[PDB]
Amino acid sequence: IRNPMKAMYPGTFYFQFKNLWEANDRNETWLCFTVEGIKRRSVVSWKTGVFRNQVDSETHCHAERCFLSWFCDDILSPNTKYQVTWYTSWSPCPDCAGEVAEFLARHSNVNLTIFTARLYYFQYPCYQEGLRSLSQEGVAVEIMDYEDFKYCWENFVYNDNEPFKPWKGLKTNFRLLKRRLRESLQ
Ligand SMILES: [Zn+2]
């Protein structure tokens, strides 16, 4: 089973996480994570990293599946509360949603929040219901805003101490996507 990368190069971050337009040429999904272990009111562990995949692959090769299989080792330690945060470039498909729901049903000491740059195939009902299902499972699903993109820049990128520079329309696109997500998650 696949280990996470440490970080993205700046060119990849800007390309992969751009919040559209419509992002036709984005046939990968990239996924940044933080995992925080809390035991007796204190941080016992902090792990970060990145998984990726093609939009061509069998669903079981999805970045979220890689994260889930990787995380399920001694990387999980039964007595500890885990806070997992994902920042994904495309929102998760129905089956990943299903797998996460099973994963969380399985491991009840884990919480999860998903920030997503873009909404994947969102005109169609399957991808909407995948998101609703995560919400129902008690998983927060949020559109990435400026501070989320900056947070990723500052944690998951070989940024060479250069600052985060937003692209034109970042904020505009955020609001559109946030409206679409909100509407879909009622
Ligand atoms: Zn998936």
Swiss-Prot record:
Keyword Hydrolase recorded: yes
One Pfam family this sequence matches: NAD2
PROSITE patterns: CYT_DCMP_DEAMINASES_1, CYT_DCMP_DEAMINASES_2
Consequence of changing residue 137 to K: Remains sensitive to HIV-1 Vif but abolishes Vif binding
Regulation (activators, inhibitors): (Microbial infection) Antiviral activity is neutralized by the HIV-1 virion infectivity factor (Vif), that prevents its incorporation into progeny HIV-1 virions by both inhibiting its translation and/or by inducing its ubiquitination and subsequent degradation by the 26S proteasome.
Main localization of the protein described in the UniProt heading: nucleus
Substitution effect: residue 75 to A: Resistant to HIV-1 Vif and reduces Vif binding
Entry keywords, A to Z: Antiviral defense, Cytoplasm, Host-virus interaction, Hydrolase, Immunity, Innate immunity, Metal-binding, Nucleus, Zinc
Mutagenesis / variant outcome for changing residue 76 to A: Resistant to HIV-1 Vif and reduces Vif binding
GO molecular function, one term: zinc ion binding
Tissues expressing this chain: Expressed in spleen, testes, peripherical blood lymphocytes, heart, thymus, prostate and ovary.
Chain spans, region (Microbial infection) Required for interaction with human foamy virus protein Bet: 36-82
Effect upon mutating residue 107 to D: Resistant to HIV-1 Vif and reduces Vif binding
Catalytic residues identified in the record: 64 (proton donor)
Nucleus among keywords: yes
EC annotation from Swiss-Prot or TrEMBL: 3.5.4.38
Effect of residue 105 to K: Resistant to HIV-1 Vif
Effect of residue 68 to D: Resistant to HIV-1 Vif and abolishes Vif binding
Matches recorded under InterPro entries: APOBEC/CMP_deaminase_Zn-bd (IPR016192), APOBEC_Cyt_Deaminase (IPR050610), CMP_dCMP_dom (IPR002125), Cytidine_deaminase-like (IPR016193)
Known outcome of mutating residue 103 to D: Resistant to HIV-1 Vif and abolishes Vif binding
Additional observations: It is one of seven related genes or pseudogenes found in a cluster, thought to result from gene duplication, on chromosome 22.
Subunit structure of this chain's protein: Homodimer. Interacts with TRIB3. Interacts with AGO2. (Microbial infection) Interacts with human foamy virus protein Bet; this interaction does not induce APOBEC3C degradation but prevents its dimerization and incorporation into the virion by binding of Bet close to or within the APOBEC3C dimerization site.
Family, per entry: Belongs to the cytidine and deoxycytidylate deaminase family.
Role, per record: DNA deaminase (cytidine deaminase) which acts as an inhibitor of retrovirus replication and retrotransposon mobility via deaminase-dependent and -independent mechanisms. After the penetration of retroviral nucleocapsids into target cells of infection and the initiation of reverse transcription, it can induce the conversion of cytosine to uracil in the minus-sense single-strand viral DNA, leading to G-to-A hypermutations in the subsequent plus-strand viral DNA.
Protein's name according to its UniProt entry: DNA dC->dU-editing enzyme APOBEC-3C
